[PDB]
Symmetry: D5
Subunit: 193 residues, 10 copies
Amino acid sequence: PTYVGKEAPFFKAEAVFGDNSFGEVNLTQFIGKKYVLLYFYPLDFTFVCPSEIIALDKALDAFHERNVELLGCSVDSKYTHLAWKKTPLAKGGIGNIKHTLLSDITKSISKDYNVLFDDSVSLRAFVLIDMNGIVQHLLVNNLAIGRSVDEILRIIDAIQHHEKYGDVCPANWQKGKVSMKPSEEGVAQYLST
Amino acid sequence: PTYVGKEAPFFKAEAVFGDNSFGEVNLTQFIGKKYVLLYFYPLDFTFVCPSEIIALDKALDAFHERNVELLGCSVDSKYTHLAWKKTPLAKGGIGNIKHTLLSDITKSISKDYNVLFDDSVSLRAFVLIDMNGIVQHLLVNNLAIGRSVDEILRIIDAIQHHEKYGDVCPANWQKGKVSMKPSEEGVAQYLST
Amino acid sequence: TYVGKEAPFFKAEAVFGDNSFGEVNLTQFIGKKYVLLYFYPLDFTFVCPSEIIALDKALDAFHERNVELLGCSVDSKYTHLAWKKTPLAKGGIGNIKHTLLSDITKSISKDYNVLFDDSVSLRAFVLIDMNGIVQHLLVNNLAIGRSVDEILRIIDAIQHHEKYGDVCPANWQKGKVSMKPSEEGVAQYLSTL
Amino acid sequence: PTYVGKEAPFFKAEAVFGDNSFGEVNLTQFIGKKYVLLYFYPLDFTFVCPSEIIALDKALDAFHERNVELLGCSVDSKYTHLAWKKTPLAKGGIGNIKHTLLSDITKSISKDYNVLFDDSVSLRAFVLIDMNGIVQHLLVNNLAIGRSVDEILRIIDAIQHHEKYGDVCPANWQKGKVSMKPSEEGVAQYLST
Amino acid sequence: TYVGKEAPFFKAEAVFGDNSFGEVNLTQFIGKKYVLLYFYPLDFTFVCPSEIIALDKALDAFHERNVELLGCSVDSKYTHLAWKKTPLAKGGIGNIKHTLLSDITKSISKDYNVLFDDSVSLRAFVLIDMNGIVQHLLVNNAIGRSVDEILRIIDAIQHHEKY
Amino acid sequence: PTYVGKEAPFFKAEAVFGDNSFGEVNLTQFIGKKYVLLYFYPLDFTFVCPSEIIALDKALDAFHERNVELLGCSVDSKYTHLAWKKTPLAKGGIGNIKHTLLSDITKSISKDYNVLFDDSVSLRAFVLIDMNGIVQHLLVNNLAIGRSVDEILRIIDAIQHHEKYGD
Amino acid sequence: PTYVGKEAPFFKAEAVFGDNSFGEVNLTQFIGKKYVLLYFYPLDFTFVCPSEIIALDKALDAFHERNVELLGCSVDSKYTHLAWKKTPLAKGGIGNIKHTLLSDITKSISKDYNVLFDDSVSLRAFVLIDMNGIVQHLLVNNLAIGRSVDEILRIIDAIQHHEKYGD
Amino acid sequence: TYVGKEAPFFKAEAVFGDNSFGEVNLTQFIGKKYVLLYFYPLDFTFVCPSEIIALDKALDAFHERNVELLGCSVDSKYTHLAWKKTPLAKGGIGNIKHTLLSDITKSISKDYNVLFDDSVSLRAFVLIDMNGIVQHLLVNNAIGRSVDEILRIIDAIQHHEKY
Amino acid sequence: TYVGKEAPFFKAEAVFGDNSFGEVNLTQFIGKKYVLLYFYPLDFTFVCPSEIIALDKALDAFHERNVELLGCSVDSKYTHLAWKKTPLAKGGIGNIKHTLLSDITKSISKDYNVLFDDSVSLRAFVLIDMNGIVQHLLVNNLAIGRSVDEILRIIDAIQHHEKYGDVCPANWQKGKVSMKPSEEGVAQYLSTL
Amino acid sequence: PTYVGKEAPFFKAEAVFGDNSFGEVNLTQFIGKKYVLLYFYPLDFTFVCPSEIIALDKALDAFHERNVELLGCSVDSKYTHLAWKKTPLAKGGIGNIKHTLLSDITKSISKDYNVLFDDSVSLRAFVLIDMNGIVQHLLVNNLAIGRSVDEILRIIDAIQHHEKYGDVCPANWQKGKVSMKPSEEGVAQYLST
C-alpha cells in the first residue's frame, strides 16, 4: 500500500552539509522539530538535476520561513556530491549550495520510498514530511521532466494552513485565497462564490 | 516497485459521460489516440472534491488543446455521480460538468494505482498517462490538500515538449522558457544562463 | 452459515434519524434490543427507496416489538445524507427516522455473505436476537422488494417461540394457534386441520 | 461468496415421488424447463416440518401454474420419507403428498447450499431457482420458525413478472399492484405516491 | 485397528426401552457392563427389523452375562421412536426394550469404521468388555446375522477372562 | 474407511501347499473362479491355534463343495509352517493338513487387511471374498476362542443364497 | 552413516533362555557388565542355520571366559525358537542350546542394525558390542556359509588386547 | 543395506602396481572379476602397512580365485605413490603390486558407509561377485584383520555359487 | 568460489579511453583477449587514483601480453567522465586510456563477491582467460594499493603455464627456471636450490 | 557475501609443529596476540607446493619480526604432513620446516574459506588475519601458479603501516615510499608527483 497520509519510512544517510563537511542525517532528528522536504534526483553530473538543485537552493529562505528542512538525495556517494559542488556552474556543476545532500549509496532510501528506477537511480520525487513524521505529499516525475519550486511551496503553504485552522484547501489555493471548513455548509458556501 | 516511467495498470470502469448518459471507459481505448489524466478524489458530496472537479472542468479546453482525456475517479457509484451532477453548486453539488466521471465501485482501480486509503477511499491523485500507455507523472495529496490545475498543465506541456524535441525540461520550465539538450555541453550552457 | 449462530460483529459510521453522523456497532444492542439489519445495493437507485420508505412508514411497528431498524449499503454516509435531503419527487428517500449504516469498506457485506461481484450488497434481511443470534436470513437477487408484513410476521414468530416455548407452524401469525415441540403435540395440531 | 444471483450448486439425490415410488432427481433435468423451489427441513418425524410440507402440498396447483417444481429435502433416507407418507396426519404423518421429497442422506446437498446445522440437520430454507439455473431467492429460518406459502408465491410472482417486464418491483409488491421502471424518472414517478 | 485396543469414544442421543429420549455415552459403562454395540443401515428397511426383534427377544440372555445391548444407525431419534410405534404388520420393530442410538452426525460409524459410502453403517457387531477393550468385531456387507453366535462369543470371551 | 463391501486388497504370498511343496498364491488367480476364505491366526507353535486349523481342515470337503478356497495366514515363514505340519499332533503340531498356509513374512498382508496387532502378529480373523473379489464378510477376534466352523459355513450359504435370490 | 565405532542401537526383545523359559533381554542390562556378541540368522527351521547355532553353542564356554554374552536373533517368534530347540537334531532341530535366542518379531532390531533384507529376514551377521556399548566389529554375510567360530573368538581377543594395550 | 544387493558405483584415481596413475571404476569388472575392495584409514600410520603388505604377499591366492584386490583410503594418489616409495624401515608399504584407489572426495567411503567422523574410512572388506552383488561385508573399528579368513570367505562364496 | 571456473557474466555501460560512452560485456573477449577486471570502491576518493593512474601508466605492458584492462566501480559513467576531466592536481585521474565500467546496479560486485556492506566494491583483481576462466583473484580490504609488477608477474606465470605446460614455482618470474608437473620433475627443481 | 573486511571463519585443526610433534591449533588462540597468515595448498606430495612451503620457511624470521604466525593448510592428514617433512628435498620433500602445518582432513576449513576446488583439494590461497580477527587480504591462485613471498610481506607491511598511521597506501606502496593522507588535499598533494 501507500505511505501517503501515513508514517514516512525511516532513513539514515551520510551527507555533505552546506559548509562542505561530511556528516550523517536521519529522519528521527527532525521529528517534532521541523518539516522535511526530501527530494530525489537520479544522478550527479547530469542534466535536469543541477537546474533543480540550484533552483531549490535559491529559494532556501522561503523554506526557512516555513520551518522546512530541505534534503536532496541521490544514489551517488558523498564524495561525488562534494566534487559536484566544487565544479563551477559553467562546467555543469552545482556550485556551493547551502542545503544538505544525502548519499543513498545502498539504494535503500529510494527502495523504501518506492522511487528506485531499474535498480539503478531514483526518480525525481518530492516527499513532504510533517513534524509528526507523516507524509502529506508525494510527487514523482520521470527522468526528463523537471519540477516546480513554486508548487511545493504552495503545497507547504496549504498543509500548514490546514494544520493551523482545520480549514480545508480548495483547488488552486494560494495565500491568502479563501479556504473552506470541512462541512456540508461549508462546501456549499465556498462553491457559490 | 513503482509504475512511474512504466506501463499504466489497466482499468475498465462504468462511467457517467458529459451528457449524463451511462457507459463504460477503459484505458485501452485511448492507447495510441490520446493522453490520459486520471484524477482520483475520495468522495462525492464532500468538500475539496467539488472545487477540484469544477476547476478542472473550467479548464477543459486547455486539456482538449493538449490532446488529453480528463477522467475523474472515485469509489462512489455512477448513480451517486449523476445525483451530484444534478445537485446545484449552491447546495454542494458539481453541476453539469463536461468531462467523464469513473466509478471505482470495486475499489480495484485505486488498489492498482496504490492510492486506496484505509480500504475505503482513494487519495487525491494525478496520474498522467502518455499515448503509449506509460505513466509520466504521479501526484498524491492527502485528503485535506487540494491540487493545482496550472501545475498539471505545465507538467503536460513539459512532457509534450520533451516528446517533440528530445530536449529535457529544467526546474520551473514554462512555455516558452529555455529548454536543454540532455548532454554534457549541454547542461553546461543552460546553467550559465 | 451463521443462521442459528452468533451474528458477525460490525461497527459502522452511520447517519441517524436527525441527519447527524455517528457510529453503530452490533455489541451495543446485545441484551438490549433485537436487530433487523437490512442490506440494499445502492443509494440513488430504484427499488431501494420504496423498501426504505416502506420500512420507515412502519417504524412504530418495529419500536413496539423492541427492534432496531438498521439499513446498510456500500455508499458513504455523505451519500446517505445527500439522499435524505433529496425529496421523494426526485428519487430521494426524504427524512427517514431509522439509522442508515455506511459499509464503505464492504467488510459488513463480506462477513454477512451478501456482497455481489465485489461491488454491492444484495437485498437481504438479517434478524438478530437480544442474545446476538441470527434467527432469520432472507436474500433477494432481483429488485423484487421485500414485504414488511412478512418480517413483522417473522419477528412475531420468533418472539412467540421465545415467550411460550411453542414452535411456530406453517403460515403462523399473531395470534392464531401454535404447536408444542412434542409428539403429542404435533398430532393434536395436524388433526383436525 | 454467496450463490444468490449465481448458478445453483448441482445436486443429485434419491427421492420418493408422488406415487410413493423411489427414483432419482437431479438439478440439470429442470434446466431450460422448470423453475425449482428447493426447500429444506430438519427431520421427518418432528413438529414444524409436516405442517409446512402439508401446507405446500395443498398449494401444489399454484406451483404447477407457475411452472415451478416443488422439491422437499431433508437428511432422512427415502425409506424414512416413505414411512412418513404411510403415517396418518393424526399420528404425526404427512400422509400421501403429491410432490417429490429428496433424500439428502450424505448431507452433501445441505453442505452445498450452506444450510447444514451442526453437521446434523438442514435448517428451514427456501431456494428458488431460475429456468437458467440461477438462484434468485434464499430464505433461511432457524429450526423453530415455520414459513409462509403466500410469501414464497408472491416472491415467485415478483420474479416471473420481473423476468417478463424488466420492471423492477418495489417493497410489498403483489400480483399486480403498481410496479417500477428501473430508471430516473422512473423512481421519481413512483415515489409520488 | 482398535480390536484388542480401547473402544473409540461415543456419545449419542438415544431412545430408551420406555420410549423416552436421553443421552448414552461409552464412559457410563466402563468398569460396570459389557457393551454389545450393533450397527444396522436404516430404519424402515425389509431386512433390519428381524435382527433387532430377534436381539430384543433374547434380551434376558444379555442381562444374564451383564451385557448392555445397543443398536445404532444414522437415523434420528425421532425416526427411531416412530419405528417402535409402527406395528409389526407394517414393517415396524415394535416396542423393543433395549436402547437405540442416533448416529445423526455419522461420527460413531466413522470412528468404528463401518460407514459405507458416507451414507449408512454396515451390519456390524462390537463387543466392548468392562475395561473398555474391543474383544470382538463382525462386519457384514445385506447379510443376515445370528443371535446364538454372539452369545457363544460373549460366553467364550467371558470364559477366557475368568480363567 | 473399510474394505468390507469394496475390493479386497491384493496380496501375493509364498505358500506351503497340501502336499508340503512350496509355491505362490495371489488374489487375482481366484477372481471369476473361486470364493476365498482368508483366515488369520497369530503364530505357529502356540497352544490354542492347532485346534482351530485342525477343525477347519476337517471341514475342507464342505468348502470345496461351496466353491471356496480356504487359506490360512500368519506372520511366520513357510519353513515354520512346514515344520509345524511335520510336528505330530501329540507334541502340539497340526499334522498333514490339506489346505494352503500363506506366509505373511513381510506383515504386509496383515497391514492391508488391518488385522496387524502391535506391528507383530495378526489377530484371529475371517475374510470372505466372493468370485468378484469383493469382501462380503469380516470377523476379528482379539483372543482366542474360536471360532464356529459352522458359522463361516452358515454365513457362506447366504452370502451365496443372496448372490442368487433376494433379501 | 554407520554405528561401528559409535553407540550400538538400543533393543529390547522377548527371549528364550537356556532353560527353555521365557523373558526379556535388553542392551542396557549389559553395559558395564558384559561384552555382547549379537548374531543374526535368517529363519528357524532352515537347512543351513542349525550347524552355525550348534557350533556357537559348542564354544559357549570360551565366550563366558572372555566375558561375552552370546545372543542369537532372528525374525521368528519365541514360540518358533522353543519348538526348534525341542526338534531333535536328526529331524533338523537345534536341540537344547544354552545361550539366549532373541525374537525380532517386530523386525525393529534388524532394521536398527541394518541387517534386514527385503523387509523380511535378517542376513547372517555378527555385531560385537563392548562393555561401554560401543560397536567394535561388524560382519555381514549374504549367504550362507559361515562363519568361523574361531574368527569372532580371534577378533574378540584384540579387540580385548587393544582395550588394555596398544596398536 | 547393500549386502545382497548391487555394489554402490565407484570411480577413482588409482596408483597401479607399476606406479603409474590411472582410473579404476566398478563397471570394468562386472561379468569379468570378483572384487575385494578394502578400506583403511590413512597412509603413513603404524597399523595400516602390515595389512596391506600381508594382502600383497598373498596376491597369487587372489589371482587364483579371479579376485581383484583394491585398497582404498581418503588419501590422494600422490600420497599413495610416496608411501610405496618409502622404505619398509621407515614405515613404508614398499612396492606392492595391487592397485590403491584414491578416495579424495570421500564419496566412495560415504557410499559404502564406512566413513567415520567425516574424515577417514574404517577398516572394511567388501567382496563384490562377478554379477556386481555384494556378498560379504566386514567393518572393524583400530582392530587388525586377517588374510586367511577372507580367503576362506571367498572360497565359501565361490563354492555356494557353483553348486 | 569461481577461481578455476568460468567468470560470471557481466554487461556494463562504460567510459572509454576517448571519453565516449559505450557498453562492454565479458563474452566479447572470449577467444580474443585476456581480461584484468579490477574493482575499486569510489571515484573522487583516495588510493583509487594512484591505482588507476599506475595501471594506465603501464598500459603498454598489458597490450603486449594481450590483456584488456577494465576498471569497475559502483559509480555512474557520468561520475567516471567527471573524474577523467578533473586534473591530477585536484584529485582527478585525468585522461586515462583504458575503459572504466559503471557497476551502477551493483550486480557485478555481487556476482564477483566483492561488494562490502551493500555499498561499494572492495579493491580486487580478477584475471580472466581467453577461455573465460578465472585464473587469479586478489582482494584487499584496506586502502593499501595493489602492485602492478605482481599482476604482470601473475599474467606471465599464467601465460607461461599455458605455453609450455610447465608449472610455475614460488617466486617465479619471466624468465627464470620453471618446473614440469611431474615427480621427476619436482625433485630436479628442489635440489640444488 | 565475502569475509574480506569482516571476521575470519573460525577453524580448529590437528597440526604438525616445527619440532615434528602433533597438536591442535585454532584461530581464537591468536586473537589479540598475533597476525595470522593462513595459506592453503592442494596436496602434499606434488609440485608447486613444496617450493612455496620451503620459500615461506626460509623467510620465517621476517614473519616473526612482523608478529605474524605462518600457517600452512592442505586436505592431507597430519601423518602425511609428518612423512613429507621426513622426506629429503632431493626426493620431493619439504624437509624439516619450522612453521606449523594444519591438517584439513574434513575439508571444512577449505569450505569455510571458500577455497575448496571440486570437493577435493584447496586452491593456493593466502589469507591475512588481523590481531582483531578481521581478514584484510585474500589471494586465490589456480593450482598451477606459485605465489610470491616478497609480495605478501609487502602486503603485511602495507597493512601494519595503515594500522599505525591511518595513512592510506597507494599503488605499488613499499616500506617505505611516499604514502597518502585519506583526505581531499590530500589526494591533490600526492598526485603531483
